[model samples]
Target: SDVNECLTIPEACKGEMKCINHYGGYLCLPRSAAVINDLHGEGPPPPVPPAQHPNPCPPGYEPDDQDSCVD
Candidate 1:
């Protein structure tokens, strides 16, 4: 079976270059070049936003009665 080095190896290509997988091999190229060819003229789509909540308190802090975060 053919192996995909790009997925199997972490950081197979370093710096600004991205990895392109092929049968039994891979190639590292500039991020822009990879994105252009990968998209094939298609526009890049925005990522889906994560769920939101009214409470702005982070972990280890709880919202008080006045909606303020208290440690």
Candidate 2:
């Protein structure tokens, strides 16, 4: 009888992990935990750019050649 761990016994492995049957025997593979933990590449769009003000630069300050706000 061919050993079929997957069919022979189901639920032996639970959660994101999966069971892979190989000729030699078998192997257990783990799925990405990001989905399970609801982990996205980065956090909350960088938290609204530190502040909710119209612009990062103070009033009267204009964006300089370097793309930074200068007085």
Candidate 3:
């Protein structure tokens, strides 16, 4: 009767990130550790990259989905 994604279907979000439970089901946040800036912060900047901002959402979190990376 109830859909607890974290318990019911953990494989749907199998990867680097964890499953974020929601009202209906759940979603996976982008799996990333260093946000470029934080990784290489000593320099001026990483330089202007793609709108997606260079692998911003890891593998499964591309921009088309619009479910992971946000500007």
User: Which has the greatest lDDT?
Assistant: 3
For candidate 3, lDDT tens digit of each residue in 1-71?
Answer: 13323234223343354433333344455555323333434556546533333334444444222223211
Q: CA lDDT, every prediction?
A: 0.31, 0.31, 0.38
Across 1-71, the per-residue lDDT of candidate 2 in tens digits comes to: 13323334343344333333333233333334211222234655453354332222233432121111221
Compute each candidate's TM-score over C-alphas. 0.24, 0.21, 0.22
> In model 1, which runs have C-alpha deviations exceeding 4 angstroms?
1-8, 16-22, 34-71
Candidate 2 CA-lDDT value: 0.31
Cα shift from native, residue 20, model 2 (Å): 3.4
Q: What lDDT score is found at residue 11 in candidate 1?
A: 36
Q: Which ten residues in a row have the lowest lDDT in candidate 2?
A: 62-71
Cα error, candidate 2, residue 13 (Å): 1.9
TM-score of 3: 0.22
Clashes of each: 0, 0, 0
User: Which residue pairs of candidate 3 clash?
Assistant: none
Model 3: CA > 4 A from native? 1-27, 30-41, 50-56, 63-71
Q: 2 or 3: which has the higher lDDT?
A: 3
